[model samples]
Target: PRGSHMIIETPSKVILFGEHAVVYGYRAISMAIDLTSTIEIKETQEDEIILNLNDLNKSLGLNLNEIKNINPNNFGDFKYCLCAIKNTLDYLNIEPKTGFKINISSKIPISCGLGSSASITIGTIKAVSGFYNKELKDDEIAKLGYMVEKEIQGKASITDTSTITYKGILEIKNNKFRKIKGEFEEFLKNCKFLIVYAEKRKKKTAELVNEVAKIENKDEIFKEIDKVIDEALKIKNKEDFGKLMTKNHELLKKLNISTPKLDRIVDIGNRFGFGAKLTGAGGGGCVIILVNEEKEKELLKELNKEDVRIFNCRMMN
Candidate 1:
């Protein structure tokens, strides 16, 4: 508790391939970007845990005693994340003798399919755990974060936390990441990724994931996702990557996740000669586009849709 105040910045994530199928044990590729969530932690003299989420304009002051008594089933999203951390500390027989204030802020939009919640969880856990000098390894952090997500989202694929913690393009299979490839520096140099929000927002990640689980004979979708994943892994050119993007979007549509707005965006992106696909759980969220930097201005002018929020940022390796 005597260390300097600690802060952790975790980037928002996008599942470029294997969305629904990943829940059923298919490998998915995800990338993190500079747009991130930041969590700052500092100690105080009191015994409460103060959470200040500036972006949400809400703060919660939790009595450590009450938090320790919380039922895991009754905890909300943020509460569940903190419960995971507190439980971890309790397991290690480490108790916070002093109060702490955690301030969280994010550039990513929540419920917009950018892994904003996971970023918050990762950033918070990393900052708190780091401040306590709890040398948690990458896999340990990932497992704890996965548990936190499962506590709220019921059953997450661990793709979000795994990619964000590692900060690269990862092939996540089972609950483990099989390959951590694609240096962010190199990918940022060669790629221009445009993230466009579809204006329509849906809070259906948990529901859609459950629906996907109920699908009969999901192996066919898994096979198709695998083909896309294999091709995505071998892409040397951005155009090839874009083609896979189209295929991936088509697969999401087949899974009935794509909305009309998402379909319109994809169509508009393709018509403008930009390779595009829906990013995240596709009921309504952001779409990722692969386009030449030179054509960015012209492409934006052509699409000319006011409902879309376009981010022409490069992917983090």
Candidate 2:
């Protein structure tokens, strides 16, 4: 058992463009938001490892067998939790002589593609590593988290784990990941969004992505998205970026993932001097309205009348 405790936090992810395409190894822009998940781990001196998921109102007590025999076929939220512990143990090559209790609290809405799974996975890795006093690089944590995700959900984009670990604007191209570092200040200042959380969860992300793969021209659709991101980073005017956002939303609709509720938000955003698009795997999750700061309040006012939960967010790059 350890004497002192360890605490870790990780940011949520939002895909500004290219959600389903990213799963197919295409380009996308994912930003780390201010929303986060926190993990608190302390020695318990018990025979069992305890997990208290504060947000989900679930409690699990796992013995060594539970952690060690985590099967991908039986994977799930808590199973991912057990699998995360197992992965970290394998990485550190250390066996727990004594037990610990991990308390998790997160604001990232689950099942809405907000990186909740990755955030929790990353946080668990960090906390466990610290418990063993083993320091890991950002990529290492992300990689381990991605491994956990792959086991649990079956298909995962490294972008979700990677962007949340690194934070800020993450661009993946040519099998390379880089953080966009310059002139993002004024660009961020001009870039404002009214993040819309859906009232109800729509179809599963995997299902929607599978549908896209079945019927769409994946090459042309994603290339257009890549082109839009290329131009958006170059343009300083917020409105110009909105045009690209509009185009991206149209593409998502063609993918058949965009829902009626999302279309309504996009319609309202179009009327309010902004562009809107579904942020993540969009059989329905959430949408972001790309608008200038000047009209943010007006847009929020108009959108408040709709059935969405409005969260004012920005690109922290």
Candidate 3:
């Protein structure tokens, strides 16, 4: 393994339920998609860290002192990710033997509902830790990734990291995850999910989380979200799940995250035999739909819009 580099690619995630509620210790369900952030680490001749971020068109060259000066807020998402990795290394009482070059690339759009930031953080940690032959457990890696996001996002629920780390449908309650178990796997095989990215972008995640924290009667609202999520998990048919999705959207609307355009999309989806809702933090990001196997093509054809980007995906085992 001497002269060899280590690379890690971590996938993006979508929250199916309990977006804001998860912050208050309610249940949330999420899944990771194939879209990913990739990181590569290689020993370098210079006694410094060289960072290249292809997606953001940015670069940073840092020694240990410069790494210490990185501000998560002032710097871009990639810089924050590197800072987190450095912090993890320091926590483990390990020192870099040689300077390294880190390159990052990703297909996931930043500030959208997709877990772009979290994926990059996880991938960077994996690459750097692997370079030193460190053996961090999956949960340990996940916790480190979550802390990175929390530093940037203020108060992030563990749903995003858990989904990406475990790579499946997860039932997350009270910051704990239980992999979805049973015959639902076969049902998921027949189901199709369509994610539509509305041209709208969200405000910084930290701001949204803080705004939601000020709302009154937060616990009651979270209880409602938990109810919808519980019902959604018990369904065996697409139509039934769609109903749950609509209910979840209504709850999000009350939370002041759903937009007018998102409401219109949900109405259109319902007309096409699908269940739709705003995905992610939803102050204007993306909308997701659960479409019946037979109606998926027709639904997409009828609802085609230039501003909306759509993707077809399914639950992965």
The model with the greatest lDDT is 2
User: For model 3, where is the 10-residue window of minimal lDDT?
Assistant: 64-73
TM-score of 2: 0.89
lDDT of 1 at 180: 55
- Ranking according to TM-score, highest score first: 2, 1, 3
Score every model by TM-score. 0.87, 0.89, 0.86
lDDT score at residue 154, model 2, on the 0-100 scale: 61
lDDT for each of the candidates? 0.74, 0.78, 0.77
- In candidate 2, how many Å is residue 119 off? 0.6
Candidate 2 residue lDDT tens string, 13-63: 888777767666777777887778899988878777898988878898877
Clashes of 3: 0
Instruction: At residue 117, give the lDDT of candidate 2.
Output: 77
RMSD of 1: 3.1
Arrange candidates by lDDT, descending.
Answer: 2, 3, 1
Clashes of each: 1, 0, 0
Model 1, position 37: C-alpha lDDT score: 82
